[model samples]
Target: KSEVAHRFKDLGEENFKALVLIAFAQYLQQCPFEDHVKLVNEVTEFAKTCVADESAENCDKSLHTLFGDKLCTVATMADCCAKQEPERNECFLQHKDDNPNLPRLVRPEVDVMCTAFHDNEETFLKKYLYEIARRHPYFYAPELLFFAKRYKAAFTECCQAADKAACLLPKLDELRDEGKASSAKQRLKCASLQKFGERAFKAWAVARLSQRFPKAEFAEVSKLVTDLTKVHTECCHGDLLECADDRADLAKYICENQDSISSKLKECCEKPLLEKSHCIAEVENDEMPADLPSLAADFVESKDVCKNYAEAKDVFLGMFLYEYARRHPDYSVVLLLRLAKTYETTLEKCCAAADPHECYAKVFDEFKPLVEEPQNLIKQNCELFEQLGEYKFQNALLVRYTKKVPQVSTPTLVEVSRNLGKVGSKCCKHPEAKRMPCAEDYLSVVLNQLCVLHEKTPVSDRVTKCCTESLVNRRPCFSALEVDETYVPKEFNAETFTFHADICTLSEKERQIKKQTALVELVKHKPKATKEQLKAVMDDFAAFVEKCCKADDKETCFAEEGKKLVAASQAA
Candidate 1:
């Protein structure tokens, strides 16, 4: 500690500014101070014009000593701070303004000037936290929970900002290694996303601790444990295509409730070797083929065993739903329809390069049972299936398949088929279809026949088959009710409503349509949207509408009379 301090004390003013800037950068990155005053002062001092304009050349020796050799702790902090102080403060201030209800800074040394304002607080916060976390991942220890607690607010702010960049594209050109640029960018994106997610949770935990702990500058230690476990679960179980090790480890910690043993690996590969002839040829022609793809390819080709493991894990999980659908055959047309939808979703995620014909063929097969068993079920279940259309299912499959896997190889199809077959068998025993009108004892056999058809047929055929079977086996369970009671008027005792009969008819239809729609939608939107997001939109459209329109009493009070329709339409 003395030696470290002595080095700082001996540096000249110019050298000192550089060192201070570097340290300040790290400090901002973590923003670990319970009170942010220390950081504010450092930023103010570093931002002064005298030091701000110091030439990079003049500071080169000091900068090298501090941040160049290997990102030494002291030097790195100074360098990052020096570079980021103005931007960081400016970002924080803007966040403060956007949220006027938030508390104000109490420090006098802090400069709250116009140019000093921060950008999007959340985005800036995320940028700093990610940089720091990446550089010093070891500091994020369960044992050092106290230290970690201090920066929770700052970390949370960063995370919230990053959520805005959710769809930001990667900088692929930076990848110089062969065939590794795209994959590397993907890995970076995943890592950055995961870290932001984990840190956001951490921030929440810290706030809770401050509000409700025995020593209450922090929250319950046990809660931290739980939250960390949850974060880890998200990391491991969540889609982690081409994400970094730090993010994966964070996920492992949260979900698995333990530290990951995996080594930290650089996501990008080394630069490719170029022959003199090739290099010269390119220079002479003044025409060079794009190098980015080649670099990305090299990275992909050089990926290690760990990358393979990550990739394989993603592929298998993506395929799980498909496997389950193929194995089950006893549930009825509805179940097969559901399975087809699920398989299509899985395929969308894991089979981007897969032939479109093959994808449709499989979907048709799984849904064929629905087309065959109860044709009327389609009309009944129209709304249920409408929520998840075929296109959505296909999109989901694409997201899963095209997702960056640590490894790149075709997943085995055998397991997928076997699991699906089992699911089909389970459907046979479902209680709802026990008493089909076709035959008493043969109901189970019939169910299996339809389900097997679902498994065997392609996507296109599956729908047609299910529809056909359903039409053939259709029957009315109840003809009419007979009232023999003596009454003043004979017509007075007639059946009041067909509600019970209507329900029975609708239930089967509702199930079938829902199953069909879900499969279809899974294929359409899975690429850009996550499974959770897709489900949220599909399952909660009504709720979303309810929330959005809650303030309009007119919506609630509108009558069925044509007057209301005229008023509503006119208002719109």
Candidate 2:
């Protein structure tokens, strides 16, 4: 015992206590849910008596002595008998009986007081233990654990508070002293406050959603919470302190317009694309802050016209607003509000006079110069440039189709837009204009290909292959293919297109090898063909390819001819 004490003496009394507490926590990890509750109840009682002596020296001595003897005995027995709940409980009981001299550290009154809180039980127990450890800060682990749990709980509670501003201001005020103490402390407070604000906004949104959609499933509720939170975070720059008043105003407006809010949210969740857009437009109109620029109202009003031209007004607005806010984080709401008027006027003049696609084209033409600017090109610190490029490309396609023939359906338009977006991201890396020409030039080609292929094949497969493989491979060859004088071969001719001619030949050879392998497998299975018979079949396939594989659509031609050759060989 003296040797053990000497060995741990350098750790000091506080560290020793912390080490015991850590071991205790580890022990609790093995406990069942019910056993955890029971153990917490027991620990709650024991902590009060043992921890009541606030002196570092006394508490340290108590913990070291306790851990050194009876506690160690009990911990060992608990570990040994951990396989079953009954055995663990019996072992603890027997140990307690045998060690009658063990300290009666557990206090009943303390246990009763701590157990009364209705919040998360684990959280409550952790906080209770943390508070005990705080009275003696020399316990390094417990002190660290206590502060961590304290800050987390406080921040989480504040963030999820119903009245966010009310909940947050006081907490921030409490941290003012620490915030002023030093740079590191200030940073800690700032980060925690920022996190608290974000969480508070989410909580406020979820609460509003819960009230409006009382019977919504967890999934639906989660989605609404996420969408609304994204709007506030992205649009508002997630600066809770600065935007607290505005957030409260929005929250009040939502509650006031419960029916409208609920209907729009429900539509946003459950309705088909166009109808959902209509609902979103109406909701945006209702939710537009009164203090915003007059253009905001016009922007809200113009949704009807925009929705007419746009296939997915909701998606467009969501992406547009998110980018607008992200790019102009400092004054996004005001800037967007002003831009709304510009959009409104454009829609009114163009859409009212011309066809929907034509009006969209005119609007996009106006936006093109703005998108070309270097500053605007790299918005969101260039992190979301891909999404921005994709959005611009879709609008570009709309403009192109409006100027020419718009034969595609809404679904097909969406499919083409998705493919074009991929091409824009892949091609557009540096300055915007260079990528725009490449994207726009390929857009028409890709659109024509997709429109023709969509009629023959599955939309998903066609879109994926066109964007990922065919369009990607053809992008660099656009200029060469576009020239009438440049004779680009229609078939995979090795002499005409040398770059991928070998690749095409290799692909064909691989296909032939696979067919040969399959035939060999068939021969092995049935013993239908000898070595000479298989060689004859191979010769026939070679003759067939030599005669027919030169035809356009050689893959299909070879496939058809290969089958007849195989059957003829098998019959012979």
Q: Give the TM-score of each candidate.
A: 0.18, 0.17
Model number with the top lDDT: 2
Instruction: Quickly count the clashes in candidate 1.
Output: 139
Q: Per-residue lDDT of 1-572 in model 2, one digit per residue for the tens?
A: 23223323333333333334433433333322343334434433444444443342334443323332333333434464433433443343223211122232232342242333334544554543433322221112322333444444555665555764566556644543222222121222222223346543443334334333443343454565665554344222212211222333344444444464454454453553323332432342123222433323323334455664366543344334333332332221222333333454565566556564455444534544444332353333245545445544444333332222222233344444445545546545645523433343344344534434343334333233433433212232321222122222122222211111222465553544333333323332233234465556555655675665466766666565645655565554
Clashes of each: 139, 1
Which tens-of-lDDT digit does each residue in 375-460 have in candidate 1?
34323223333454433433333233223210111111111122222322232233343312112112222222323233333333
TM-score of 2: 0.17
- RMSD of candidate 2 to true structure, Å: 25.8
Q: Which residues of candidate 1, in runs, are more than 4 Å off?
A: 1-23, 26-28, 32-572
After best superposition, candidate 2 residue 196: deviation in angstroms?
25
